[PDB]
Paper text:
SMARCA4/BRG1 is an essential catalytic core subunit of the roughly two-megadalton Switch/Sucrose Nonfermenting (SWI/SNF) multiprotein complex, which uses the energy of ATP hydrolysis to remodel chromatin by perturbing interactions between histone core particles and DNA. SMARCA4 can remodel nucleosomal substrates by itself in vitro and is functionally and structurally conserved among eukaryotes. This remodeling enzyme possesses intrinsic ATPase and helicase activity and has a C-terminal BD motif capable of recognizing lysine 14 acetylation on histone H3 (H3K14ac). Bromodomains (BD) are conserved reader modules that bind acetylated lysine residues on histones. We use the reference nematode Caenorhabditis elegans and its SMARCA4 ortholog (SWSN-4 or CeSMARCA4)—which is conserved among eukaryotes and constitutes the only SWI/SNF ATPase in the worm—as a model.
To understand how SMARCA4 interacts with modified histones, we determined the crystal structure of the C. elegans SMARCA4 BD (residues 1176–1296) in complex with an H37–20K14ac modified peptide at 1.29 Å resolution. The CeSMARCA4 BD exhibits the canonical fold of a left-handed bundle of four α-helices (αZ, αA, αB, αC) linked by one long (ZA) and two short (AB and BC) interhelical loops. Residues H313–17 of the modified histone peptide could be unequivocally traced in the electron density map. The histone peptide lysine acetylamide binds within the central, largely hydrophobic cavity, as observed for other BDs, including the recently reported family VIII, yeast RSC ScSth1 BD–H3K14ac complex. The acetyl carbonyl group of H3K14ac forms hydrogen bonds with the conserved Asn1263 residue and a water molecule that bridges to the conserved Tyr1220 residue. Site-directed mutations of Tyr1220Ala or Asn1263Ala in the CeSMARCA4 BD independently abolish binding to H3 N-terminal tails in vitro, as confirmed by ITC. The H3A15 sidechain packs adjacent to the BC loop, anchored by hydrogen bonds between the peptide main chain with the carbonyl δ1-oxygen of the conserved Asn1263 and the backbone amide of Glu1264 (Leu1573 in HsSMARCA4/2). The H3P16 cyclic sidechain packs closely with the Tyr1262 benzene ring (Phe1571 in HsSMARCA4/2). The H3R17 sidechain is tethered to the BD αB-helix and BC loop via hydrogen bonds between the sidechain nitrogen atoms and the main-chain Gln1260, Thr1261, and Asn1263 carbonyl groups—all conserved in HsSMARCA4/2. After refinement, the dominant rotamer (60% occupancy) forms a hydrogen bond with H3R17, while the secondary rotamer (40% occupancy) is oriented toward Tyr1270.
Residue numbers in the entry:
A (entry chain B): 13 to 17
B (entry chain A): 4 to 113
Write the structure that this text describes.
Amino acid sequence: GKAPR
Amino acid sequence: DPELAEKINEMLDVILEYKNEDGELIADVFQTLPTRKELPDYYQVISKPMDFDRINKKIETGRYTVMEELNDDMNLLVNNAQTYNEEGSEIYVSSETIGKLWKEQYDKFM
């Protein structure tokens, strides 16, 4: 559940 | 040192058992990082990876001799999540909650 920049 | 270990385990259990309003264990996504094979781009951004798997291995092998060393690792865990992930994302928000929970534990250990 990552939200990379 | 068994006393330090037991203090550590008691403080970390607070964080590891905490659930958000949605019923999600917020710490679950911080247990195990994606591996260097699965997500190479994480490691190009994050120079010093940290997760609860690594913290446990350090407890078991005597690498924590003082509480400030764990405080460094928990600040690393949190700061890495906020470096990597976008502000306002669920994972970023969870990291903020972990940071607050940890500071309460650390401040009360003293």
